[PDB]
């Protein structure tokens, strides 16, 4: 049982190929998860949105 | 970049030249001029001229047929 960082280096960081592949694969998932958590944090500290305002106007 | 002195190797050639203030700027301008441009024109007519007359022939015939295609169109429509 080596180290996380060790195993990480061997399988993905060593070759500049996989190294770069890792970051483009890692950026896609990051943009998504960071935008979720972020906006959520932005809403949680607010709530005078147009989100909770809609419930009132589904009609016309 | 390349400077004089580092260009290339030259063996045994003498070059005589003369001051511009000592000679004419137009030696025999017409005397020797005309004959030469005749000579250069002659030397090249046959490779330059032909494609142009070809275009020339195709240009006059091309517009011709363009008018005679419509204007000339009627023509006959007899009944």
């Amino acid at each position: 049982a080596p180290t996380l960082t060790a195993r990480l280096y061997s399988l993905l960081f060593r070759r500049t190929s996989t190294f770069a592949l890792t970051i483009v694969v890692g950026a896609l998932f990051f943009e998504r998860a960071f935008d979720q958590g972020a906006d959520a944090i932005y809403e949680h500290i607010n709530e005078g949105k147009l989100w909770k305002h809609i419930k009132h106007k589904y009609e016309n | 970049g390349r400077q004089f002195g580092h260009l290339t190797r030259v063996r045994h050639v003498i070059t005589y030249s003369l001051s511009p203030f000592e000679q004419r700027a137009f030696p025999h301008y017409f005397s020797k001029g005309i004959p030469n441009v005749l000579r250069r024109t002659r030397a090249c007519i046959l490779r330059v001229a032909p494609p142009f007359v070809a275009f020339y022939l195709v240009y006059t015939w091309g517009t011709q047929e363009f008018e005679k295609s419509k204007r000339k169109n009627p023509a006959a429509y007899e009944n």
Binding site: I41, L50, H53, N60 | -
Partner: protein, 241 residues
Amino acid sequence: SDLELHPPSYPWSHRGLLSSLDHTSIRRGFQVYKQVCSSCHSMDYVAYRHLVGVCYTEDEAKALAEEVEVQDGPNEDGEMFMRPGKLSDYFPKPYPNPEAARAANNGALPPDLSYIVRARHGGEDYVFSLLTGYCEPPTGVSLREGLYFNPYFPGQAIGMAPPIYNEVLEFDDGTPATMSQVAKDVCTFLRWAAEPEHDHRKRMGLKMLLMMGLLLPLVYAMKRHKWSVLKSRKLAYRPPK
């Protein structure tokens, strides 16, 4: 007249760093604009569609747009009729010529409202204070006709009538149209009529701080790595003899 006073710090719901506007409060504010200000105050830049994402909804915007009649494009005979109300066009209202604003309100220009919160020092608070400020002239003093009194004003001699307390309403669901409740709402809307991007701006601003919060340390640890070769380098001087 030469002396002046500046506004206090009303704790707006959008004064804090990452603070969104109160969309419910932007609504009531537009109402305050339409019923009251709109018959004196041009608002050349905002439109009914601008309201769509903000406060109202699709159909609602259409309806409020239809409650006026604007001069549409000329037709075949070179006409220029009138039409219900689209969504497209803005709120070009009160007067045609600018001097026609002067002919009505005695020699005074009620300036565009899209401006306002960013065109006057203090922003919302100066407009909040100027509206709910309205007080009575003490000694010395004068006034021409009805050049009303206002402390929060350059010179104290305005030409604007105090159209505050005339309790007008339509605060759907139920909201007391008191002077102060009416002033907060106009301002809150006026903030949004000047800086619509306001909330997105700060949403990004959060990400900007949150991003830099990971990057600054990182792009700094990177530079350390490379300079560490230099930082711990050891010199020795070994001259002959």
